[PDB]
Write a protein that binds this ligand. Structure first.
Ligand SMILES: [Ca+2]
Lengths: 156, 145, 808
């Protein structure tokens, strides 16, 4: 338990960037804890972010670097953050023919209709960014999508 | 700090020299008022001297660089500044959308004062309620309008 | 579903892939959705709102309505995976409601066939359906039940395979009253054994040589009973024979348990056999005169006790078809007369009056006696003589004249009954003659049709006999099930911990047939002159009340609502019976002298009466014992035709009528038994593919062993080791386990999708990050240069150097 010196230096780094953008004053608007946390490598669900301090609209609450540190490590206590393993069993729930292909109409339906719904815009972005193409009707390889998404925007 | 790069110092070498001719390199009283002759503008006594106050006394070229120890402090090089403005200009040249730039300086980064904001608006190259950065970068060093 | 969900024939058997995909994905929440009792449609689906004490609050679906149902009245509904389910044994929640739903929902989507364990349930569609094509027959021929969707052909086919496979007789027991279409089904089952018999490789059809009989057999064996307009009051076993190659080699019918009693007694809204009201109709007047009667049914005590006619029944027309069939079966119109005359003879026997002097009865009319004497071809003088005052023996011959009035009337009713009984046997020996083919028989697949379990507002000695019969039949089933589940559990190496399921009904059966049991107490009490409905009653109470769980006692109803004297708990529920009359109804004494004497004149009568003083219950026991000795000598199969509604109309379900039949059916009984074991059984692979999401691991799906996975998903769920047992190919689950499992999968799948959406949110932001860093350096350089400018723009020197150099 308790973060390390380097871990702290890291949070601080992301942290400084964030308070810089909403006005360098040592505070980061609570409506940015999730984004902040994502920049530290984590992948929090909205339920997690709200149970840990996030708010919806700006101007409500603010956090110092020292307050965010404990939020970061509590957050990182959860282990079902999700594995390739898990994402795979889930896509197959939808894999009608068991080849590993899924209509991009459907995945996008899943992503915008189920769970913590995603925006039309966000779906296009992640598909463009991971460079995942659909064929005539030799659709989307859902594992291709999973790996690139899990690999991040900056591969190498 | 030493950021007073050779490009800047040598540039300051030709500057201090045109004036000079003063007993072996010293921008003295006369060297100055004389200058304001081929300068096309008015020269005031007291002030001409108040400008001396700034350095201990007697201005060779060394002290002339030390005097410019407030000029270097921030001066990020030539281009660097243009690129910096670039980043906030999607629509290539014609430049930055006023609103943005205001919100950009007034309440982001190292916030600008509502007072520093105006000092900036008074001159600011503008049209279509939009900003002109390459013209602003020019003003910084300045080769005139 | 099977073969091709889209193949045309499967329109009323399958449900298309898309349509089922659809049906299996409707909204659902195992935490609230549920079954709830509905005064109208039996049971209805709903959602729970709140809870408190043993008083739950709910909201129904199809109608919306907040009702307050008790805790032990909320019914777990099965998740969507189970909708339109094919075999109710697969259901995870096996409650009455759930049984009702699965069946209803399938009939309301055009499907009439549904499996429930060994049973094949088939509800009346009330409209021709494609279902019986010789094209479909091929899509079933030779296939094992699970290969195809539910279908009567499946059970008939497999019964045919088993027969050729194990080389032992088979039997199909089919239940179902009136509008259940039980006869069509028997017809189509016999057609099928025909199509396959000559299928292999190389005047009248079988289905019609046999259906041809039904009019006659029904005239003498069916009748209207309080709750059924045409009830066969006997059981018939249609044995279709085969040779050693599976070749149809012949057929014949053996009958059991003819309800003689009806011959001389009808209660209220009932009546004797159909024929009696047929003969006395305007279709063959001559006959009505050869018989020596007047077309007025209501004038014969042996026929008038109950009703005169039935709604929706035309006696004239029937007397017509009955007679016509009598000719098609091809039998001399002279025999066809005797048969009618003996029937007629039974009419007059009930008219004979008797008076006594001291304790010796004597005639009074002599007209009837000569009518009967004649119709039977014997001398009235003698008949009256051996009825009123017979003679028996020792080394000499005494006048057993003991006879009084009570004894003769009774002695006569017995004759009537004895005549009818022999007439019926003979009548069957004939169709059998009409059926005997040259061919040799090796095996057979018999079809049994018998009166189903009865429960009226007033059950008497007739109901008890019929319920006693069904009870031993249900037991027969319980036993068959027991032997197969035992074999099943051993096939998968699971621990079988059960006593024969048959024993669950032995107590009731024993309470009826063992010494000191109901029938025996009745018998012995039949031998006491002054015995009464009260002395017999008390002797039942003495012997069993409080002394046996099965034997209970009711309580006085609604003034006229008959007095019940005791109730038995049958597999189909608890039945309350009245005791009034049993002592009279049971006497069926044989009178030797009348027999010897009846062994004269008229040809049929010779034969007939040519082939102690007992009782109806002793004869019932004997016939029932024989029926059973025969069923247990065959491999049984069970079809259950069901009447969907009172008002013969398609796609409509009467909840109460259906459930009622299910309890008399043995269907609800078989499920009672499934509940006590491990009804759900899944192949490891199906489990792995359905629940891996509950305990994912990095090992690629294609290398993971199904059993290994199943085992780890279950223990990781810390599921009670009592709720399942891992077999050699399947895992056995108890009630509700899959109910839980499905609910966790839906839960987990929903959380996993949010997590993925989380990783995308992460990716987008982490990418936006680098742009945010670059822009910071940028906005930093700007804010300080603009600031350093705000300074120097006034520092004289800054200005100078700015002019001093453009001029270099
Ligand atoms: Ca800040």
């Amino acid at each position: 338990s308790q973060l390390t010196k380097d871990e702290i230096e890291e949070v601080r780094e992301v942290f400084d960037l964030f308070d810089f953008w909403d006005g360098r004053d040592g505070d980061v608007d609570a409506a940015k804890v999730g984004d902040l946390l994502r920049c530290l490598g984590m992948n929090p669900t909205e339920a997690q972010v709200h149970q840990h301090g996030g708010t919806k609209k700006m101007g409500e609450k603010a956090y110092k670097l020292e307050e965010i540190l404990p939020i970061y490590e509590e957050m990182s206590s959860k282990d079902t953050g999700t594995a390739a393993d898990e994402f795979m069993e889930a896509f197959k729930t939808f894999d009608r023919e068991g080849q590993g292909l899924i209509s991009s109409a459907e995945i996008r339906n899943v992503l915008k209709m189920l769970g913590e719904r995603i925006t039309e815009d966000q779906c296009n972005d992640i598909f463009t960014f991971c460079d995942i193409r659909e064929d005539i009707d030799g659709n989307i390889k859902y594992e291709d999508l999973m790996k690139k998404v899990m690999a991040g925007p900056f591969p190498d | 700090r030493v950021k007073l790069s050779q490009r800047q110092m040598q540039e300051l070498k030709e500057a201090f020299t045109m004036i000079d001719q003063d007993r072996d390199g010293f921008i003295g009283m006369e060297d100055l008022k004389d200058m304001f002759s081929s300068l096309g503008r008015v020269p005031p006594d007291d002030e001409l001297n108040a400008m001396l106050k700034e350095c201990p006394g007697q201005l060779n070229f060394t002290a002339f660089l030390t005097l410019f120890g407030e000029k270097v402090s921030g001066t990020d090089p030539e281009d660097a500044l243009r690129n910096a403005f670039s980043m906030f200009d999607e629509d290539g040249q014609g430049f930055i959308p006023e609103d943005y730039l205001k919100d950009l300086l007034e309440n982001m980064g190292d916030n600008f004062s509502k007072e520093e904001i105006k000092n900036v608006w008074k001159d600011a190259p503008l049209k279509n309620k939009q900003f002109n950065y390459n013209k602003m970068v020019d003003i910084k060093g300045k080769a005139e309008d | 579903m099977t073969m091709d969900f889209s193949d045309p024939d499967m329109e009323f058997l399958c449900l298309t892939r898309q349509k089922l995909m659809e049906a299996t994905s409707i909204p659902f929440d195992g935490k609230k959705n549920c079954w709830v009792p509905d005064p109208d449609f039996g049971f209805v689906g709903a959602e729970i709102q709140s809870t408190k004490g043993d008083e739950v609050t709910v909201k129904t679906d199809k109608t919306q309505e907040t009702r307050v149902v008790k805790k032990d009245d909320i019914g777990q509904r099965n998740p969507p995976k189970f909708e339109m389910n094919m075999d109710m044994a697969n259901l995870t929640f096996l409650n009455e409601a759930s049984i009702l739903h699965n069946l209803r929902s399938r009939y309301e989507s055009g499907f009439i066939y549904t499996y429930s364990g060994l049973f094949c349930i088939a509800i009346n569609p009330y409209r021709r359906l494609p279902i019986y094509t010789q094209g479909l027959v091929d899509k079933y021929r030779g296939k094992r039940r699970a290969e195809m969707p539910p279908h009567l052909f499946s059970i008939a086919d497999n019964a045919y395979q088993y027969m050729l496979q194990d080389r032992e007789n088979q039997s199909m027991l089919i239940t179902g009253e009136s509008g259940a279409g039980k006869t069509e089904n028997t017809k189509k089952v016999i057609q099928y054994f025909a199509l396959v018999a000559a299928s292999l490789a190389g005047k009248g059809t079988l289905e019609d040589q046999i259906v041809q009989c039904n009019p006659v057999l029904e005239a003498y064996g069916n009748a209207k009973t309080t709750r059924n307009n045409n009830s066969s009051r006997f059981g018939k076993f249609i044995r279709i024979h085969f040779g050693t190659q599976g070749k149809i080699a012949g057929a014949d019918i053996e009958t059991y348990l003819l309800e003689k009693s009806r011959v001389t007694y009808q209660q209220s809204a009932e009546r004797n056999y159909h024929i009696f009201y047929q003969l006395l109709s305007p279709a063959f007047p001559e006959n009505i005169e050869k018989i020596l009667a007047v077309p007025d049914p209501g004038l014969y005590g042996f026929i008038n006790q109950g009703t005169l006619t039935v709604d929706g029944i035309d006696d004239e027309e029937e007397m017509g078809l009955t007679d016509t069939a009598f000719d098609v079966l091809g039998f001399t119109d002279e025999e066809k007369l005797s048969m009618y005359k003996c029937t007629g003879c039974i009419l007059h026997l009930g008219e004979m009056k008797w008076k006594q002097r001291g304790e010796q009865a004597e005639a009074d009319g002599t007209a009837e006696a000569e009518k009967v004497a004649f119709l039977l071809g014997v001398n009235a003088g003698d008949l009256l003589k051996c009825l009123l005052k017979p003679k028996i023996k020792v080394g000499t011959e005494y006048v057993t004249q003991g006879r009084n009035k009570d004894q003769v009337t009774n002695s006569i009713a017995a004759l009537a009954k004895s005549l009818y009984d022999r007439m019926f046997n003979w009548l069957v020996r004939r169709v059998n003659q009409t059926l005997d083919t040259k061919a040799k028989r090796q095996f057979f697949i018999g079809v049994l049709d018998i009166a189903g379990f009865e429960i009226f507002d007033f059950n008497s000695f007739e109901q008890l006999c019929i319920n006693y019969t069904n009870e031993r039949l249900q037991q027969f089933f319980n036993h068959h099930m027991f032997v197969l589940e035992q074999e099943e559990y051993k096939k998968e190496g699971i621990v079988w911990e059960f006593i024969d399921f048959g024993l669950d009904l032995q107590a009731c059966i024993e309470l009826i047939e063992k010494p000191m049991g109901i029938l025996s107490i009745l018998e012995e009490e039949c031998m006491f002159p002054k015995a009464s409905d009260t002395s017999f009653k008390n002797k039942l109470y003495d012997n069993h009340l409080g002394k046996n769980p099965m034997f209970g006692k009711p309580k006085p109803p609604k003034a006229g609502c008959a007095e019940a004297h005791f109730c038995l708990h049958h597999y189909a529920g608890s039945v309350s019976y009245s005791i009034a009359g049993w002592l009279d109804k049971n006497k069926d004494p044989i009178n030797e002298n009348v027999v010897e004497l009846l062994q004269n004149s008229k040809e049929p009568i010779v034969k007939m009466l040519f082939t102690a003083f007992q009782t109806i219950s002793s004869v019932h026991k004997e016939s029932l014992n024989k029926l059973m000795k025969n069923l247990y000598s065959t491999h049984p199969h069970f079809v259950r035709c069901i009447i969907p509604n009172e008002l013969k109309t398609p796609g409509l379900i009467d909840a109460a009528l259906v459930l009622h039949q299910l309890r008399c059916n043995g269907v609800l009984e078989g499920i009672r038994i499934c509940r006590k074991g491990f009804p759900n059984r899944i192949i490891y692979s199906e489990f792995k593919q359905r629940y891996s999401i509950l305990a994912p691991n990095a090992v690629p799906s294609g290398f993971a062993d199904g059993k290994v996975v199943t085992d780890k998903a279950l223990s990781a769920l810390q599921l009670d080791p009592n709720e399942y047992r891992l077999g050699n190919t399947k895992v056995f689950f108890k009630a509700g386990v899959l109910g839980m499992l499905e609910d966790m999968r839906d839960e987990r799948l929903s959380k996993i999708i949010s997590m993925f959406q989380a990783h995308i949110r992460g990716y987008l932001m982490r990418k936006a990050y680098k742009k945010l860093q670059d822009q910071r350096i940028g906005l930093t350089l700007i804010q300080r240069n603009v600031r350093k400018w705000l300074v120097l723009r006034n520092w004289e020197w800054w200005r100078l150097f700015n002019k001093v150099k453009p001029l270099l």
